[PDB]
Amino acid sequence: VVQGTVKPHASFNSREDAETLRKAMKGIGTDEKSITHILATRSNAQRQQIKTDYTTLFGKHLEDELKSELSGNYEAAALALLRKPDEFLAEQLHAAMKGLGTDENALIDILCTQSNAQIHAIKAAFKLLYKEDLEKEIISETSGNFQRLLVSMLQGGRKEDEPVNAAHAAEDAAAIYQAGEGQIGTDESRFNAVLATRSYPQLHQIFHEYSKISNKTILQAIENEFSGDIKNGLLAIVKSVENRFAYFAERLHHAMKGLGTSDKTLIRILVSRSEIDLANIKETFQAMYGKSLYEFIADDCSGDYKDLLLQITGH
Amino acid sequence: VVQGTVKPHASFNSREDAETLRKAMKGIGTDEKSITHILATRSNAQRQQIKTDYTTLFGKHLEDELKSELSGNYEAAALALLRKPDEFLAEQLHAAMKGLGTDENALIDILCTQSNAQIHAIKAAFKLLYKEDLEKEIISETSGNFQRLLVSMLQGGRKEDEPVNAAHAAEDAAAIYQAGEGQIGTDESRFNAVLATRSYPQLHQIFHEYSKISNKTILQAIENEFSGDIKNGLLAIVKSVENRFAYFAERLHHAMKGLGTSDKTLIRILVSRSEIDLANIKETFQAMYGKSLYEFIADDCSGDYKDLLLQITGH
Amino acid sequence: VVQGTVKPHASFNSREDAETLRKAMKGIGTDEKSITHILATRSNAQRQQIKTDYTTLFGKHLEDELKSELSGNYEAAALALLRKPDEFLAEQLHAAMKGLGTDENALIDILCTQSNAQIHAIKAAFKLLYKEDLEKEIISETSGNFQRLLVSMLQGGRKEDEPVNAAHAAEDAAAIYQAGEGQIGTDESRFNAVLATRSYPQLHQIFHEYSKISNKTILQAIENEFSGDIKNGLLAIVKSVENRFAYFAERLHHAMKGLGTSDKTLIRILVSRSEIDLANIKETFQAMYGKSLYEFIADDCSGDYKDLLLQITGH
Amino acid sequence: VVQGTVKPHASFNSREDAETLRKAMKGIGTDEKSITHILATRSNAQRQQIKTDYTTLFGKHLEDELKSELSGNYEAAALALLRKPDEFLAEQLHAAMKGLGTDENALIDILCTQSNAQIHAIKAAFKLLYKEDLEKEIISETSGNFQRLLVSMLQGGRKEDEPVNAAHAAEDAAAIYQAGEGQIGTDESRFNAVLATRSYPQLHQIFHEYSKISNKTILQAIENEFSGDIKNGLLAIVKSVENRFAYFAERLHHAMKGLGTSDKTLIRILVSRSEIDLANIKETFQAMYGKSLYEFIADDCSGDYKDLLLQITGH
Amino acid sequence: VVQGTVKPHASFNSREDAETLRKAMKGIGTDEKSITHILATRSNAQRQQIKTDYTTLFGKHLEDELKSELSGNYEAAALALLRKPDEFLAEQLHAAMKGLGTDENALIDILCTQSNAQIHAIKAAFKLLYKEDLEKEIISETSGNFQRLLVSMLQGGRKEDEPVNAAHAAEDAAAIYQAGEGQIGTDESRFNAVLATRSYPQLHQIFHEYSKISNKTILQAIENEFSGDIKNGLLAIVKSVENRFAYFAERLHHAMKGLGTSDKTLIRILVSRSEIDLANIKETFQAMYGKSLYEFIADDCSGDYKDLLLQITGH
Amino acid sequence: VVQGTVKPHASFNSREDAETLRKAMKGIGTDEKSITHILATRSNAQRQQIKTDYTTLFGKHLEDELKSELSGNYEAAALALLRKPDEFLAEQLHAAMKGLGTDENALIDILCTQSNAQIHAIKAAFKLLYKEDLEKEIISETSGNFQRLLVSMLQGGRKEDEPVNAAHAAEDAAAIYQAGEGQIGTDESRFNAVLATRSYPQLHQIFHEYSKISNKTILQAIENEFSGDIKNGLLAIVKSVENRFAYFAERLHHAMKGLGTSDKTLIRILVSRSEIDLANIKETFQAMYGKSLYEFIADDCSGDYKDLLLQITGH
Ligand SMILES: [Ca+2]
Ligand SMILES: [Ca+2]
Ligand SMILES: [Ca+2]
Ligand SMILES: [Ca+2]
Ligand SMILES: [Ca+2]
Ligand SMILES: [Ca+2]
Ligand SMILES: [Ca+2]
Ligand SMILES: [Ca+2]
Ligand SMILES: [Ca+2]
Ligand SMILES: [Ca+2]
Ligand SMILES: [Ca+2]
Ligand SMILES: [Ca+2]
Ligand SMILES: [Ca+2]
Ligand SMILES: [Ca+2]
Ligand SMILES: [Ca+2]
Ligand SMILES: [Ca+2]
Ligand SMILES: [Ca+2]
Ligand SMILES: [Ca+2]
Ligand SMILES: [Ca+2]
Ligand SMILES: [Ca+2]
Ligand SMILES: [Ca+2]
Ligand SMILES: [Ca+2]
Ligand SMILES: [Ca+2]
Ligand SMILES: [Ca+2]
């Protein structure tokens, strides 16, 4: 079964939890252990009900309160947990795009791994938060082959109900072959077109047909025929169709690798997947990497930052 | 029974009414007695149907036609009567905030005396008429304890289905006591939090428990522990819980007291409550004040302004 | 039966059609015969499915690809066929109003010949496309009696469910008579008022009553009492009530008259009536004018423009 | 000499005056006598320097502080006195137009009595404050002959350097005569045209030429040929050309007449002419009305409101 | 000498002219002969003074009055002549871009034949009229090589003070040769780079160096190496450097060729060059075409449209 | 002397540098060594000249070209170097406030260390880039004492021309003493008010008077009477007045401390002070820290990022 690590607190009362957070912040200092405990043990919908009771009881929004009480990564991870899911991704896209430079990788994690219905919700929430239109913003901040793949992803046009038909999986696998390996350059239109429109079941069957004609896997073929941003965008889709839990277990491992941490990725994957398949992502992490995801966080992170994260994650 | 003073015209024809109003304004002069009569004897829903036939028969809006034929308080009262009810309060709020100064008292009349579903409607009609967000605009034009009470009010978060439970009514009455009378200062958070979230039946029970532990009523305690705008904000909620008809009979009485009139209060309350509980507000007014509301208006107001008001109100 | 000239392609595949249009523009040149054929033999809803698949396969919009491959009227007509129908009218309006001058005649064709629900959709699509409000925009770009008829039109307030009542048809016929013929001036309010509010069935009955009291038809009386823009605005309503097909067969004939063509009218009527009643407009054209519609276009137009138009029209 | 009643404080220090206001609001209560004293004995440019130092010393704007400490008419007058002069009128216009109704009379006081240069500054300050265009807003909120008079005033196109030429003063006086008195109706275009473009010296000479061809004055001729808003509009210009001080002495007298006060007018004229010609408006008031301006305000107004107003006006 | 065909009316009075136009439109009908006369015999700056007096005398804008009195091409030409010159061109770009399709040719006439300082003004007038940014809009409505040449044009970065240096003219001519003729493809960056940055004196020198190394002129080389929009974009710059008057005499000739007229071009070139170099364009027309520009218009055009146009042009 | 580490390239040609950057990116790969070289050895105004020529030569902006060729921290440091100086800071503010959380420290680095003139430019560049108002944005994203210190900073109201007057330096040092050390609480208004308004020379004199009355330095008293955000806000002003170069040397040292780097601080301070006083900040770094700033970067950083940063810094 695919499930996340956060489950709704049983015998929840938003009034009482709003009043416990007010008490945790009252006076000088803050009781972070209380804040961490409430946020990390209520589901996102319960956190949204705590938030309406806090503003009705107190006249101030819980968000504004935390930004004055908290700092740095604990503030960011806490604040992430109160964002309605769709909005959080909508906001993470914004951050990737409108800074100095681009988090190319944040855009791939969010647009390339998504269903049609999720793309339609991330597009809506961005419009609502930012008044601008995301495809118009993606087209302003990206160019070339990469831009084109993210414009495809924003349409929500995959033929998700297309059935596995092996004669066609074979026609497409051959088509991709001629585009890549079968010629000197690469016709990128054919990579983008097939990986953007075919259902995920039908894409699986293509990948298998491709290994019977070629002596490289489709991953190897993209890895050789493509460079940079579009190479990582197209491999994200291949990894999503083959095994989504491994894609994120990978992206998480890389956040924690070497010196320091890429907390931005860490907060983003842990928080977004927490109520969808963070349980599965954890078993795939362990199997691929030796250590547990818990152990990994426990070593790379510190303070309350580390605690909040380790209570979302669980052992 | 709680009822207003304006009941829908039986055998109403908006085409014929639209035609009458054009005839009452044609030429030099205006036939005010005819405008007064159609506007005051039609319910607001009928006046909205008159409004659509006027613009489709004559290609100009009835409002624009009135602003030319009328002046001063008769124009203001006549135009008040044509506004959709939600829009009229959203518009009164705009006028209280975005002038020279603040009509602190219009903002309390509209936000502190409302149910969750009416707050939600006044908020939406505002965003529609003004493109801005009311909670954002109240936060720009107010400060401190009063701003927080109006931010609580705009959430629509009262637990209106909360049942009378005496043990709790008793625990909150005790908590309000310590926050006020039982200490030198005043913890205002406690006052704001209890009056803003409990249901009105549970609040009634609290006020009763408070008098058994204090020798003062909750109104006296507020009157003493608080000043200015928040003192008035908080007593509007207590007065709405105990007797809403008396709150408004009071506010009307003060509009008409002394020299001149506060027509802005007078038009706003008469017109908003005309199809809700103006009958009951009229009986409480006489009971509290000696004179009838009819008689009060007849003395303080003049011309056609006086007649339009006296026809909405009735004897 | 009333029916247009374009019927949905049976065994339609949007993925394959998108692919064929990419193949038709690939390289230097364009294969216009291929574009003409896909556009002219798919219904507008099928063209919208081809659009979503083109953008998901290729990551560029079919519109942007045609603007670069095509030019002049073939670009205009091809692009007109791809617009969602409501949008295409909201766009036409924009073009009439906001240039050097006014295409007075576009505004009448679109606003004066429409049902309540169609007026409400054109109004919506305009607000969506252009963020401004259409009635605010028609009031900025028109004045006087004309402005007033087009504001009436924009209210969607015709009493479409008004039943044929001869006694009343007779009272209004007589009212229009006094306003016009029965007096030196013209009371325009009465011509506007009756033509804007009465159902089309009840209007038919009035035109009949009018010929029994007058020796002139309502057309001749409008033709004489009125000038210019409003004279053409009021005759568009009468012609729509008596015979809509003839209104357009007329408009079309005039587009193709003399030296050159008014392609802007030609593309607009052909394309908006193609799936509603272009077949009926074509019979009425022949009947009124001797030659066929097909024959007329075939003579006044050229290139691929002419072929596209001839395929949408049929023989 | 023409001069106002408010002169710059000699040995002014904005830092000290900012600190004195902070001390007058500190704590419970407010020391209104101290706020009245600084605001009323500092010229408007000194008040703006007090405003910058308050916000740099305490990090809150002075305005926000006074809205919390003050109420009603004292809040409104104290806040009027802190507005930059051009912004105060741009705001007074906004208030006259976008409420329930129109203060027809505020609009004429501001737009009909002004020079080209002032109109151009009220226009600019409005667009700044409100992002909208004043002419576009006057055209939305007014109709007909009055709207045209107000659009004329907003152009800033009076030929102010036009010299007195009696042959033409005579030609125009005659033209005005034929437009009005010399015919049954009124050609308003001629009244509008000559009163809006000719210089004020040349206009004076015209009024004189008129009385030699008519037995009525131009005032009487306007008074009879015109009604309502445009009659008051055109009389404002005539009284501004003949005697501007008397125009305001009149409007002030009427603000204070009868029961109550029209404080809105009262604050508006006293505060806007305080540094221009409130000295002269005061002599003309006494001379026309018997009592002093000071004496009038002292009877019609109360509290601290009356004190502020009595310090701006002087004896 | 380079000069236009409209010269400022000597003994011009804007008040008297504004009055003459009101008289021309008063009543039923319009006196087009009078409007044609004032418009065509006043310079553009005088027309802007007539425009302010008309609005200050009558309270309505001249433009709005002409849209109600006029129709079709006379309305368009008479309104073109009242537009401030910069605005006219910003408005023409808007009309080329934001309709159904693109007038690719309007964009090249305006952007590819301009100085740095004129581009800078057309950019400014667009942002002013439209609130949007012209480069942003040109990037939305165009793609590819063409887009890139128009984004170059909009920078205003031509090195206008660069001096004729034959060694470099020779070096660039050589560079263009290799880009084009000297290879199978075309490196377009090299054509775009040299024709967009070098001064017009230097460019002339290059064209001359080019003919000594090639056997084709740079025109023939562009004509062969390029296609469509970019081919005409690049040839507009070469024809502006060699002879601007011939570029427009050609554009004008094609507006009038065949059946009908392209009035849109005809009004646009005649009105924009009328005070710059229409007299030169007229001598080049005759020289190149046989007939006079006057005689051409006289045959292709009609009504008052034809007259207005023949007055602007002269014999 | 106070000077930065980047000096204008002598014999600079923007056309040739723009061509060099095109060649460095052409094809697959990028020649980062060339890009680093031009960006790091041209002053910012020279970089703006390169930018205009790149877009006029190639029709695409240099920023868009780098985002596609670069990645990570080299992208951000390269793009940082191309921003107009005022825009860069206005962009840094935006990134500090509008993400998940607040970079409290970037806001103090920027707003608390600036002159009046600099604050006024950051305010303008923000409004321009972001259409919003910075003060309004700081007031949205910050609360309490901190917000008030940053609102004071945004006023540009420091009396920079205030002269050192020992009697007053002593009066204020004693006021700060009673506000802090001389009482249990802290009156923060007094710390805010003296630090925000007095000139930097007068402030130095105050700090000296304070140590004669107290036994602790003003830094120790702030360190003890204050907490968090406002403690760091007030200490940045005290460090700015005493020694600006040490404030930054301190901030840089902390960016590079421990595991990882805070690149965002590193790029921000290196880039902003490069042409102002990076030479002095480097001497103060060595003196305070043992190692050179060069040596520090060279250890904490890698790749091309490290090279770019080491070339802007110098040895
Ligand atoms: Ca705390
Ligand atoms: Ca914080
Ligand atoms: Ca290959
Ligand atoms: Ca690590
Ligand atoms: Ca009337
Ligand atoms: Ca009115
Ligand atoms: Ca107490
Ligand atoms: Ca009274
Ligand atoms: Ca092609
Ligand atoms: Ca095209
Ligand atoms: Ca008649
Ligand atoms: Ca024809
Ligand atoms: Ca106080
Ligand atoms: Ca107040
Ligand atoms: Ca008369
Ligand atoms: Ca009075
Ligand atoms: Ca006319
Ligand atoms: Ca027209
Ligand atoms: Ca070639
Ligand atoms: Ca022709
Ligand atoms: Ca490259
Ligand atoms: Ca990148
Ligand atoms: Ca202390
Ligand atoms: Ca480090």
Q: Which residues contact C186 (CB under 8 A, 6 or more apart)?
A: C179, C180, C225, C226
Q: Which of C182, C100, C107 is nearest to C150 (CA)?
A: C107
Contacts with D22 from chain F: Cβ below 8 Å: 189
Kindly identify which residue of chain A lies nearest to residue C22, measuring between CA atoms.
Answer: A189
CA distance E57 to chain C (A): 19
Record: contact F75-A144, CB cut-off 8 A:
no
| Rounded Cα–Cα distance for residues D110 and D93 (Å) | 8
Ligand nearest to the CA of B260: 8
Contacts with E64 from chain D: Cβ below 8 Å: none
CA distance B196 to chain D (A): 22
Q: Chain A contact for C128, CB < 8 A? A: no
Ligand nearest to the CA of D30: 13
Record: contact F15-E159, CB cut-off 8 A:
yes
Task: Label each residue of E158-197 as H, E or C.
Answer: CCCCCCCCHHHHHHHHHHHHHHCCCCCCCCHHHHHHHHHH
Contacts with A58 from chain B: Cβ below 8 Å: 148, 152, 189, 192-193
Contacts 24+ apart (CB under 8 A), E59-66: E59/D147, E59/D148, E59/D149, E59/D150, E59/D151, E59/D152, E59/D192, E59/D196, E60/D148, E60/D151, E62/E18, E62/E21, E64/C143, E65/E21, E65/E22, E65/E25, E66/E25, E66/E35
Record: contact E68-C144, CB cut-off 8 A:
yes
Task: Label each residue of E276-308 as H, E or C.
Answer: CCHHHHHHHHHHHHCCCHHHHHHHHCCHHHHHH
DSSP string across chain B: ----S--PPSS--HHHHHHHHHHHHSSSS--HHHHHHHHHHS-HHHHHHHHHHHHHHHSS-HHHHHHHH--HHHHHHHHHHHS-HHHHHHHHHHHHHSBSB--HHHHHHHHTT--HHHHHHHHHHHHHHHSS-HHHHHHHH--HHHHHHHHHHTTT---TTPPP-HHHHHHHHHHHHHHTTTSSS--HHHHHHHHHHS-HHHHHHHHHHHHHHSSS-HHHHHHHH--HHHHHHHHHHHHHHHHHHHHHHHHHHHHSSSSS--HHHHHHHHHHHTTTTHHHHHHHHHHHHSS-HHHHHHHH--HHHHHHHHHHH--
Which residues partner with D101 through β-bridges? D99
Record: contact A55-B157, CB cut-off 8 A:
yes
> What b/e string do you get for E131-142 counting C-beta neighbours within 10 Å, with b at 16 or more?
eeebbebbbebb
Give me the residues of B, 140-179, that contact A with CB < 8 A.
Answer: 147-152, 155-159
The C-alpha R_g of chain E, in whole angstroms, comes to 21
Record: contact A158-C56, CB cut-off 8 A:
yes
Nearest 5°: phi and psi at C106?
Answer: -80, -40
CA distance C269 to chain B (A): 26
Q: Which residues contact B147 (CB under 8 A, 6 or more apart)?
A: A59, B138, B139
For residue C143, what are its two tokens?
């004045």
Q: Which residues contact E305 (CB under 8 A, 6 or more apart)?
A: E72, E73, E74, E77, E263
CA atoms within 13 A on the CB side of D302: 5
CA atoms within 13 A on the CB side of C36: 17
Contacts 24+ apart (CB under 8 A), C13-20: C14/C46, C14/C49, C14/C50, C14/C52, C14/C53, C15/A159, C15/A197, C15/C53, C15/C57, C17/C42, C17/C46, C17/C50, C17/C53, C18/C50, C18/C51, C18/C53, C18/C54, C18/C57, C18/C58, C18/C62, C19/C57
Contacts with E108 from chain C: Cβ below 8 Å: none
Domains and CATH numbers, chain D: 11-83 (1.10.220.10), 84-157 (1.10.220.10), 158-243 (1.10.220.10), 244-315 (1.10.220.10)
Q: Which of B314, B272, B308 is nearest to B293 (CA)?
A: B314
| Rounded Cα–Cα distance for residues C72 and A295 (Å) | 66
Contacts with A19 from chain B: Cβ below 8 Å: 193
Nearest 5°: phi and psi at F99?
Answer: -110, -145
CA D259–ligand 16 middle distance (angstroms): 5
Kindly identify which residue of chain D lies nearest to residue B78, measuring between CA atoms.
Answer: D101
Give me the residues of A, 78-107, that contact F with CB < 8 A.
Answer: 79-80, 91, 95, 99-102, 104
> Of the candidates C22, C57, C60, which has its C-beta nearest A196's C-beta?
C57
Nearest 5°: phi and psi at D99?
Answer: -110, -155
CA E314–ligand 20 middle distance (angstroms): 20
Contacts with A139 from chain C: Cβ below 8 Å: none
Answer for the pair E178, F39: CB distance below 8 angstroms, yes or no. no
Record: contact F151-D22, CB cut-off 8 A:
no
| Rounded Cα–Cα distance for residues C31 and E191 (Å) | 28
Record: contact D196-E60, CB cut-off 8 A:
no
Kindly identify which residue of chain A lies nearest to residue B155, measuring between CA atoms.
Answer: A56
Q: Chain B contact for A60, CB < 8 A? A: yes
Find chains touching chain C: ≥3 CB pairs under 8 Å: A, B, E
Give me the residues of A, 181-220, that contact C with CB < 8 A.
Answer: 189, 192-193, 196-197
Give the distance, in angstroms, between the CA of residue F86 and the centroid of all CA atoms in the same chain. 11
> Of the candidates F22, F53, F59, which has its C-beta nearest E149's C-beta?
F59
Taken in order D20, D24, D25, D28, the sign of the CA dihedral is positive
CA B198–ligand 7 middle distance (angstroms): 22
Q: What is the largest CA-CA distance in chain F?
A: 70
Q: Chain C contact for A139, CB < 8 A? A: no
CA B150–ligand 14 middle distance (angstroms): 14
| Rounded Cα–Cα distance for residues A216 and A266 (Å) | 32
Which residues partner with B99 through β-bridges? B101
Burial of residue E221 (number of CB atoms within 10 Å: 0-12, 13-18, 19+) = buried
| Rounded Cα–Cα distance for residues F63 and F83 (Å) | 10
Kindly identify which residue of chain A lies nearest to residue B156, measuring between CA atoms.
Answer: A56
Ligand nearest to the CA of E259: 20
Record: contact A155-C22, CB cut-off 8 A:
no
User: Resolution to 1 decimal, in Å?
Assistant: 2.8
Record: contact A157-C52, CB cut-off 8 A:
yes
Nearest 5°: phi and psi at C173?
Answer: -60, -50
Q: Which of A143, C30, E268 is nearest to F69 (CA)?
A: A143
Record: contact E68-C227, CB cut-off 8 A:
no
Contacts with B120 from chain A: Cβ below 8 Å: none
CA C218–ligand 11 middle distance (angstroms): 13
- Amino acid at site B118: Q
Question: Angle of helix B44-58 relative to helix B72-82, nearest 10 degrees?
Answer: 100
- Amino acid at site F63: E
Answer for the pair E248, E281: CB distance below 8 angstroms, yes or no. yes
| Rounded Cα–Cα distance for residues E73 and E76 (Å) | 5
Question: E84 in the Ramachandran plot: left (φ > 0), alpha (ψ -120 to 50) or beta?
Answer: beta
**Cα–Cα distances in angstroms (integers) from residue D71 to residues A227, B101, B287, D28, F303, in the given order:** 68, 8, 30, 15, 64
| Experimental technique used to determine this entry | X-ray
Record: contact C158-B58, CB cut-off 8 A:
no
| Rounded Cα–Cα distance for residues E306 and F184 (Å) | 90
Coil, strand, or helix at residue F101? Answer: strand
Contacts with C143 from chain B: Cβ below 8 Å: none
